[PDB]
C-alpha cells in the first residue's frame, strides 16, 4: 500500500524533473503553506514555471503507477474514486476518468485564474504511512497532486 505510494512519489518526481525540468532548487511561484489531516505528512517542493507540462507528467506518473499495479491492487482502485471524488469507474476506465476529472477541475477559474501565492492543502482522513505532497509550483499542477493525494489517503483506509 505505502509501497505503492512511494512509487508514485518517485515517479512523479522523476517524470517531473524530466519532462517539466524541475529541481528541488527551482523557485516556487506557489508555495504550500499548511498541510492538515497514524500518518506522516511532508511537502517536497519540485517547482517549475510551466503548468501544462507539470500536469502531463503527474498523469503519466499516475498512469504508469496504475498500470504497474497488480490485478488485485487494481480491483481495489474503483472504490477509492467514489470515496475521494464522488465518481464511479472501473479497472478498464480509471485512467481516462481520472484525466477528465483533472482536465475539467484543474482548468477551472478557481484553479487557473487564482493569483494566491500561498496555498493550503487539507485532507480529512489518513491511516506509520509517510505521505509526500510534491509542490509543483502551479495551481494547475498542485491541483492534480491534490487529486492523487485524495485517492492515496482514502486508500489507506483499508
Amino acid at each position, epitope marked *: 500500500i505505502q509501497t505503492t505510494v512511494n512509487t508514485l512519489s518517485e515517479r512523479i518526481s522523476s517524470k517531473l524533473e524530466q519532462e517539466a525540468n524541475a529541481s528541488a532548487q527551482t523557485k516556487c511561484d506557489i508555495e504550500i503553506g499548511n498541510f492538515y489531516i497514524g500518518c506522516n505528512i511532508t511537502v517536497k517542493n519540485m517547482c517549475s514555471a510551466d503548468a501544462d507540462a507539470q500536469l502531463d507528467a503527474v498523469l503519466s506518473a499516475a498512469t504508469e503507477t496504475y498500470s504497474g499495479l497488480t490485478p488485485e491492487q487494481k480491483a481495489y482502485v474503483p472504490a477509492m474514486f467514489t470515496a475521494a471524488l464522488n465518481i464511479q469507474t472501473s479497472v478498464n476506465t480509471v485512467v481516462r476518468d481520472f484525466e477528465n476529472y483533472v482536465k*475539467q477541475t484543474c*482548468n*477551472s*477559474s*478557481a484553479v487557473v*485564474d*487564482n*493569483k*494566491l501565492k500561498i496555498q493550503n492543502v487539507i485532507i480529512d482522513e489518513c491511516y506509520p504511512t509517510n505521505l509526500e505532497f510534491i509542490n509543483t509550483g502551479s495551481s494547475k499542477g498542485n491541483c492534480a497532486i491534490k487529486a492523487l493525494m485524495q485517492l492515496t489517503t482514502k486508500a489507506t483506509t483499508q
Partner: antibody
Amino acid sequence: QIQLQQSGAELARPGASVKLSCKASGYTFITYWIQWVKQRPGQGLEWIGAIYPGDGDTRYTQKFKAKATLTADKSSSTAYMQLSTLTSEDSAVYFCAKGDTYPAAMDYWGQGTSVTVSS
Amino acid sequence: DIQMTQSPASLSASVGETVTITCRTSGNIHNYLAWYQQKQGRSPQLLVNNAKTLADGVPSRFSGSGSGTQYSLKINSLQPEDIGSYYCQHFWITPYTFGGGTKLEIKR
C-alpha cells in the same frame, strides 16, 4: 467599509475615446481582481472582463477585446477601462466590481458611469 | 463557451406567494454561480454566492439551489421590496457570462 468610486457621467464623441476610472478603498486593492460589466439602457448585464491589479493580468470577453483596455494603478488603487472607437452601442452604463483572488462573483459594486456617445 | 438561459424573463405574483427563477447552462458549472438583484437605477447587489450561499444582509426568503446545469433562485413569501431585475452569473471558467434577466413585478 469597501467602496468602489467610479468616474462621473461623461459625454463622449462618436469614433473617439473615453477612459473610465474605478477607485478602490477599504481593502488590499492589489490582492483582489477587478471586473467590469456593461449595461445598455434598458438591457441586461454584459461581462467585459477583469484585471488583476498586482500582476496586471487581464481576461476579456471576445466582443470587447477590441473596444476596451483594462489597466490598474497600484499606487492610486484605481482601475481603468479605456473605450475606443465609440459607436452608439457603447452608449451604456459601465460598472466596476470587486472579485476574489480569482475573478469569481462581484460582491461589492461601483455606482456606475453613464456614457453617452454623441455629436 | 458557457451559455446561460434564465427563465422566465418576466414574473408577476401576489405578496407572499413563492417565486422561482431558473438558470440553465450549456455545460456543467459545478456550482460556480452567483445571483444578483438590481433595483431601478442602482448597481447590482449580490444575493447568493456559490449557487447556495446567501450573502450578508440578504433576507431569509431568498434561497438558491442547483446541481450541474440547472440552478434556481427561489423567493418564498414574495415582498414588494423584491421588485426589480434578477440576473445569474457563472464563474466556472473565463470568460464569464450573465443571464438574460428576470423582471419581478407584483400583482395587487
